[PDB]
Design an enzyme around this catalytic site. Sequence first.
Site: not given
Ligand SMILES: O=C(Nc1nc2ccc(C(F)(F)F)cc2[nH]1)c1csc(NC(=O)c2ccccc2OC(F)(F)F)n1
Ligand SMILES: CCCCCCCCO[C@@H]1O[C@H](CO)[C@@H](O)[C@H](O)[C@H]1O
Length: 293
Positions: A14-16, A18-20, A22, A37, A127
């Site tokens: 679901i994401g990047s 800093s190190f590792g 998600i 992570k 950061d």
């Molecule tokens: O990263 C999400 N959750 C998340 N929970 C975490 C808890 C701890 C940590 C930690 F760093 F390890 F501590 C990281 C975490 N990351 C997350 C949930 S929804 C989402 N991304 C879109 O919905 C979206 C993506 C791209 C464009 C639009 C997106 O959504 C929206 F709502 F903005 F339109 N990203």
């Molecule tokens: C918790 C709800 C799910 C979150 C979905 C958002 C995913 C979009 O975001 C992303 O996912 C990409 C592929 O989709 C990855 O390659 C990227 O690292 C990341 O930016």
Amino acid sequence: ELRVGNRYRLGNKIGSGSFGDIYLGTDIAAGEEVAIKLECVKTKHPQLHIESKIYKMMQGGVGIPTIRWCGAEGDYNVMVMELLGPSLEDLFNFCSRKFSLKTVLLLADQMISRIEYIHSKNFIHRDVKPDNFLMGLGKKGNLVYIIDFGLAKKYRDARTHQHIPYRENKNLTGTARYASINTHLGIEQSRRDDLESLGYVLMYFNLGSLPWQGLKATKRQKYERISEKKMSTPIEVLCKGYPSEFATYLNFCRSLRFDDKPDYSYLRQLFRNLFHRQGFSYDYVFDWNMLKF
Ligand SMILES: O=C(Nc1nc2ccc(C(F)(F)F)cc2[nH]1)c1csc(NC(=O)c2ccccc2OC(F)(F)F)n1
Ligand SMILES: CCCCCCCCO[C@@H]1O[C@H](CO)[C@@H](O)[C@H](O)[C@H]1O
Ligand SMILES: CCCCCCCCO[C@@H]1O[C@H](CO)[C@@H](O)[C@H](O)[C@H]1O
């Protein structure tokens, strides 16, 4: 099917971090999703256990992610956290890379407080960037969380509160786009630098981009061009078209001495007074309010 901690099903990225990176995951027992992570054990400088320790020290604070489990398992170090909502960068994109003044001020209020909290526990973040602030879920959907302690470090002694020594010749730590001017100059980061970075984040949100973004290029000339452009952009040019409080905020942060304790209350009040002068309602209706997370 991949399992970690004999408890969590590992899902997709679901994401990047800093190190590792998600990953989404499921707590099989609780039938709830979590964020996971993962750091590869063959990474050159393993950091995840250190980072998890920082999260543990921050626990209980408003807008701090909850740790559920941490441990190493074979080829990966693993950190399981409560799942949070989208990042401010995700939401900025959803909103076509422009936030209304109201949204920017609602965000500034919380973001100053998150930074103050990390400082109160003896750390600088180093950061501050939109990717490192996430909205909550459910009843916490209007709470801004701060994340990622991969670059964080102590700026003062936990017993005496004696500040770390001033020094120079530091390599860049954190994102060049949002780094303080002194960070570009190789000065040891301190509390003022987190706040200055936040200033650039707020102007990024106002403007849609910063004047030192999208410069093109050795080892490298790109960072030097960013530094030069940022350092020579007049605050009044950067902030033209926006309330004076944004330039007041930035000048304040820039004028802090290395070991100064920032007046966080003053900075919050600057934006709050503006908020109420403008006649906004403090109703947590952000630009993305049509999204129901
Ligand atoms: O990263 C999400 N959750 C998340 N929970 C975490 C808890 C701890 C940590 C930690 F760093 F390890 F501590 C990281 C975490 N990351 C997350 C949930 S929804 C989402 N991304 C879109 O919905 C979206 C993506 C791209 C464009 C639009 C997106 O959504 C929206 F709502 F903005 F339109 N990203
Ligand atoms: C918790 C709800 C799910 C979150 C979905 C958002 C995913 C979009 O975001 C992303 O996912 C990409 C592929 O989709 C990855 O390659 C990227 O690292 C990341 O930016
Ligand atoms: C439930 C309905 C919510 C839909 C959320 C999808 C948001 C897609 O997200 C985005 O928004 C724009 C359109 O693709 C682009 O400009 C952004 O770059 C992109 O990240």
